[PDB]
Amino acid sequence: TPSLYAPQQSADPKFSRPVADTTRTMTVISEQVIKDQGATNLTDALKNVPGVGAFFAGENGNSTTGDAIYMRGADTSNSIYIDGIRDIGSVSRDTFNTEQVEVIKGPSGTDYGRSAPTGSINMISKQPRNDSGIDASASIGSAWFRRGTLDVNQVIGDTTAVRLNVMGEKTHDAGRDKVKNERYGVAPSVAFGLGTANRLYLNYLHVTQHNTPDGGIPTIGLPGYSAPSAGTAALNHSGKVDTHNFYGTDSDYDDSTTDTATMRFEHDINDNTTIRNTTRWSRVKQDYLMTAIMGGASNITQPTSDVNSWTWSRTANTKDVSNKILTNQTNLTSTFYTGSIGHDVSTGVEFTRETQTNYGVNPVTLPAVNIYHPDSSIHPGGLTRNGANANGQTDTFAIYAFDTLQITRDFELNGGIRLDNYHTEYDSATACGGSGRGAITCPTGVAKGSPVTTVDTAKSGNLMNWKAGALYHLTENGNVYINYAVSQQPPGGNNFALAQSGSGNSANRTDFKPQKANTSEIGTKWQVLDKRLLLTAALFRTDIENEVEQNDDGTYSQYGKKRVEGYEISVAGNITPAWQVIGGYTQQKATIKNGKDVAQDGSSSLPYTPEHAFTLWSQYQATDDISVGAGARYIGSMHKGSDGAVGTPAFTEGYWVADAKLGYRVNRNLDFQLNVYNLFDTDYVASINKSGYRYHPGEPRTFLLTANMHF
Ligand SMILES: C[C@H](CO)OC[C@@H](C)OC[C@@H](C)OC[C@@H](C)OC[C@@H](C)OC[C@H](C)OC[C@@H](C)O
Ligand SMILES: C[C@H](CO)OC[C@@H](C)OC[C@@H](C)OC[C@@H](C)OC[C@@H](C)OC[C@H](C)OC[C@@H](C)O
Ligand SMILES: C[C@H](CO)OC[C@@H](C)OC[C@@H](C)OC[C@@H](C)OC[C@@H](C)OC[C@H](C)OC[C@@H](C)O
Ligand SMILES: CCCCCCCCO[C@@H]1O[C@H](CO)[C@@H](O)[C@H](O)[C@H]1O
């Protein structure tokens, strides 16, 4: 029987082997792991994968929000999937309706189509089970954190089950003033034909959120900060601001809703062959107003020369966006023999429509904020739509075919090919006659404030991708393997935006080529102690090509190159029946290989990427009633991107966070759980923005008390 900390196989029918026999760097985080840790959203689940987190805080005119995940050196937020279907949206994803999260490092275009040059994150949705039972949870923790979840599964006939998951969460922020979050979700589903050759699964998901967003705090007093001028020199001695200070306003808010409907048909043609057809409709809506602060010399106001009277200036960051996907996917898996060669085939076709609409809003002006005594109890405004919108649409037709050839009992080959036909359409417009960062002058005879179109173009293309691997069983517990994969991101694949062809430095020029990523991997996997403990180690290199760089004249072309190289170590499962573990270590050297350096200190490293990262979680059943857990994470130092701001830190220091846990079983119906996070109340930078004026502080020590009920 498999370990609860080491799921043996991916739920995705595109992966024809268990994790231990998959020639990929694959980590599966189970619901048991997430539950034992008290992790309630994707970001906190991903802390079980080293060097994966929200490391970029944004620029000056925008901020990152939600699951802005960085992995293998780049933003991977557009390659988060639900049940293998892309889920774009700068919102945080609750884990209440999720069975496991599958993280594959090293991109492959065969898996899910276009992607970031990093890998893939896949949340697996709960489905109705064959048993009947009720699980309920109630949590109270630091800063009046309150959470309730309910999971109900009921079998009805010989062949029908229904499942319902419900979540409610309300909290302030233990480390931040005025930041509060609130969300509610419901996920009901019904399954027909269980235990039969013909199955229907119907799913629905709704999540509503109302958060107070957080733009960060000034970087005064951090390692590397210097006052930007002689005239502001008191900022070299006035110290770090209180990490609780809120620099936003009482008008700052972040709203979203998620609505997703899925319908899955399954038909067993025989005991070896199954056809599947999945249809999903999904919409994620979000609008927010949040505060970005700036601290350059010309941003600083000095009423009194006492630094307590000084102000930084505020910039509004607004978003009013809608992301929709409609898709239909057919999958066929079959196992059969051609002579002595055994085949496990997985082939399919996908139709997809993806749309993004960014609704223009009126500019919001914010007053200066006191550096050490921010007054946030003011109501500057809210969002008013102005009719100047950006519309993106991408239509995709994809056909794929994978095969894992069993050549002998000890030697396996695997390959895959995928073809994507896409058409992308993009147009944008701005309100004319403004004075800000993207203001466009009104043309003749057009009323001031009218939507003027700045881009309206389209792009059609092909994406041909493939992968190939080889695996050898050294024993019945250990193998070795190599793997090579190609992945691409065409113009308009990152965020639907396109640029007019012929000029500019945008990777989205319709005349440019896709950014191509080629990954190589050599590793070994060992299933130890009765196949209950999985140990892995791999060497990898990703070469990224067609990056936009500038020619000797003004021209731009695609001669740039980037590279991420290193090794990966993972462990997962049971060391003894009483002792569970999960964790990993990575070393990844992300660097510019051709082109301008992008790191502030002028070296070749990529920003917002730690070079060393370590995570380890362990849980031990000390007695029949009492269990104990512990966790430790190390994130290394990283570089800020280059910006013209003067005196702001060019890098951030690595940090250690430790966690602990306690579990007490009262009876089969009731058990308690005490999680405490950042055990040593360590201070650190969790992310820095591009210019370097603001950062997100690391959360302080927090507690979380949970009551688990089962019926
Ligand atoms: C609570 C049940 C448990 O089976 O499930 C609730 C969930 C299924 O629906 C909750 C949602 C509809 O509303 C969210 C809000 C009420 O916050 C949750 C919290 C207050 O719950 C009790 C929480 C122990 O706080 C109360 C206080 C005593 O700590
Ligand atoms: C016990 C619990 C009650 O709490 O559950 C009740 C149960 C009885 O109902 C759950 C189920 C019915 O919900 C899913 C439903 C919303 O189906 C979606 C389907 C219509 O997708 C269409 C598809 C994507 O859209 C395109 C298609 C039309 O081509
Ligand atoms: C409802 C369903 C989802 O449930 O979706 C509706 C559907 C509309 O989705 C789109 C699908 C039909 O895609 C095919 C086509 C629209 O894509 C353009 C492609 C053919 O052009 C590239 C072409 C090779 O490039 C030519 C190049 C040489 O210039
Ligand atoms: C039984 C296991 C629980 C261990 C509790 C450790 C609590 C540590 O306590 C913390 O220690 C830090 C040491 O760096 C100090 O800097 C903090 O001020 C102190 O609060």
Author numbering: 50 to 760
Paper's wording?
The structure of Fiu was solved in three different crystal forms, revealing Fiu in two distinct states. In contrast, in crystal state 2, the entire polypeptide chain (amino acids 50–760) C-terminal of the TonB box (which is disordered in both crystal forms) could be modeled into the available electron density. The disorder of the plug domain loop in crystal state 1 opens a large cavity in the interior of Fiu to the external environment, whereas, in crystal state 2, this cavity is present but occluded in the lumen of the Fiu barrel. In crystal state 2, removal of the labile subdomain opens the internal cavity of Fiu to the periplasm, but because of the presence of the plug loop, this does not create a membrane-spanning channel. For the first run, the entire extracellular portion of closed Fiu (crystal state 2) was defined as the search area. In this experiment, the majority of the solutions placed Fe–DHB in the internal chamber of Fiu, with the third most favored solution positioning Fe–DHB in the extracellular cavity of the protein. Although the internal cavity would be inaccessible to Fe–DHB in the closed state, because of the fully ordered plug loop, it would be accessible in state 1, as this loop is disordered. Specifically, the external plug loop of Fiu in our structures selectively gates a large cavity in the lumen of the transporter.
